Design a protein around this ligand. Sequence first.
Ligand SMILES: O=C(Nc1cccc(Cl)c1)C(F)(F)F
Length: 460
Amino acid sequence: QPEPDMITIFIGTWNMGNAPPPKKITSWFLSKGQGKTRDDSADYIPHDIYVIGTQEDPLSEKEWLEILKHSLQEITSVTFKTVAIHTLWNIRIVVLAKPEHENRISHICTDNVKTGIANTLGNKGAVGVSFMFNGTSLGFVNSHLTSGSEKKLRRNQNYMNILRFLALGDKKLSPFNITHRFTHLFWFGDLNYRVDLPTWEAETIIQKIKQQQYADLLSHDQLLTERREQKVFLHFEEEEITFAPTYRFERLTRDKYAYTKQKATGMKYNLPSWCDRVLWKSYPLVHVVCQSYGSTSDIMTSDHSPVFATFEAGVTSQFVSKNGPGTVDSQGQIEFLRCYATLKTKSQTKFYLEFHSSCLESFVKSQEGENEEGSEGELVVKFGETLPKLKPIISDPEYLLDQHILISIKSSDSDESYGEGCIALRLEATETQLPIYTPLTHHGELTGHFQGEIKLQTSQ
Ligand SMILES: O=C(Nc1cccc(Cl)c1)C(F)(F)F
């Protein structure tokens, strides 16, 4: 029974509007409705993993698990195993997997983050799940961000709090937040970014939606504009949106957008918006392909429509050799040549690097670099040919070329990371000096760059 090198992952996000679901929700899990939809010929083919995020979920965990599992069994004739379920207030994440995957899944973690302070603490935040699928780490975040058209900055702040404080994946990766801990990270939810057009244009926007003409609406979507200005979700991907805004509908039909201000809305307008989103970030040169991204048309209990996204995702096997795990393999080495970090910091400590990777027995600290001044004001930290030779546990190129090195640049004075990045070992050649590059971030914001050359020796 061979180990897979690809899986498919279903991601769902639905703000249920505090109402029970209708009796049939199968269109959601089938990626049917509007947008990039799944071929009818695939309807009986189960996804390997289903990750369901809800917001404003009124159900108990048990109630929702029974609906989800019975839905999937009706579609696929497979009884899915529950990997994890975690709820914060009315924000929930469920992970289901095909039974064949039970002994491929391990290291399951769950956590939550509550956003805001006093007034603004009490219903917004995020839940998440991580686990290993054979040799591949997977992370999943369902967030319900702050609502309201004039709170895009609060949403951006909610995002940074969630990525700083959500404790998922390998705790030994101490310098790294969730945006670096996983081979594949999926971040979805009621992100609550709005189409930023004047209130007076509500009926114009509705007209455009009825004509399926989204371009002049998407050019005002706050999440796209904030992402293009590097204010949020730096280094994440999103499929092109080709479905109608998923909020705010009159319940029990999809024929009407309910946008006008009401006491129940705090006297706020809810112009039609793409509140409900799926984004991802995968390590460099790992296979990830979005195969659906859309909304259902036939689930109408909520003022939001459910959103689906599906992905092909590359996975690796749990590799054993005669040597590692449990020792090094002397036929393997990773060398860094001519490396330097460019940092945006105004500070003047010395810096050292840490290299973290599950291809090493443990993380490696470098010597301090040599600080120089860049021609445009920058700090340049030079490592030269001084970096420690990395000793991987396994030399086989079928393993090593699929690995990644996480890099943190840390202050000698404080041992605090000033920037984190990731280098793929999926090189064009071995035993050959090749350029490498990663941007460096801290708290998910750009703090600099790391570049140089690599020389990878495998057993071949
Ligand atoms: O641990 C659970 N599930 C689980 C564990 C390992 C593999 C798989 Cl497939 C599922 C829980 F939370 F449901 F009890």
